[PDB]
Structure 1
Amino acid sequence: TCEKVEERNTISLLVAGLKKEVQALIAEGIALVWESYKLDPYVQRLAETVFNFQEKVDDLLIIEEK
């Protein structure tokens, strides 16, 4: 999704917010190393936000071209 967003910066305009939210969760995963308690909830947040975010990038690509 971010390659479709960086190679087509017109999508990046409407993606940036949710992109940065997934980036914040990614930064959380980058910051901690071997955090057995916050591993699974961050994995859930990463997967759910990237799932929704994937739908956002694809849906925004379609809507912007429409």
Structure 2
Amino acid sequence: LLVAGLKKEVQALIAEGIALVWESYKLDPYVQRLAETVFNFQEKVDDLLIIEEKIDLEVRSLETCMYDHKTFSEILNRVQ
């Protein structure tokens, strides 16, 4: 869901290139355009995987953490 907006953008540019042809010189701006968008999509996906695993670890910690408000509240501070 978080990458839903970014992924559609690539599908849009992919949808744009599906109309283009080699005879047009629009291929070369398009090649520049697709690389930038695909480059951003890779980076933001990589960012979320790092963040999402941290959140997964943190929420997992709630199962096994000590039963006191500070221990819980500290964990809920990290996830926030």
Q: One fold, TM greater than 0.5?
A: yes
Could you tell me how far 1:35 is from its partner in structure 2? 4.6
Q: Over aligned residue pairs, what C-alpha RMSD do you find?
A: 1.8
Sequence identity percentage: 98
Question: What is the Cα deviation at residue 22 of structure 1?
Answer: 1.0
Give the structure-1-normalised TM-score. Answer: 0.70
Change (3 A) 1:55 1:38: same
Instruction: Give the total of aligned pairs.
Output: 54
More helix by share: 1
Q: Give the unaligned 5+ runs of structure 1.
A: 1-12
Q: 1:59 to 1:35 in 2, by over 3 A?
A: farther
Runs of 4+ in 1 over 6 A off after TM superposition: none
Which has the bigger relative contact order, CA under 8 A and spacing at least 6? Answer: 1
* TM value normalised by structure 2: 0.59
| Bigger Cα displacement from structure 2, 25-34 vs 40-49 | 25-34
The structure-2 alpha-carbon separation of the partners of 1:59 and 1:31, relative to structure 1 and needing over 3 Å to count, comes to same
Question: Which structure has the bigger radius of gyration?
Answer: 2
Counterpart-to-counterpart distance in 2, 1:28 and 1:55: 22
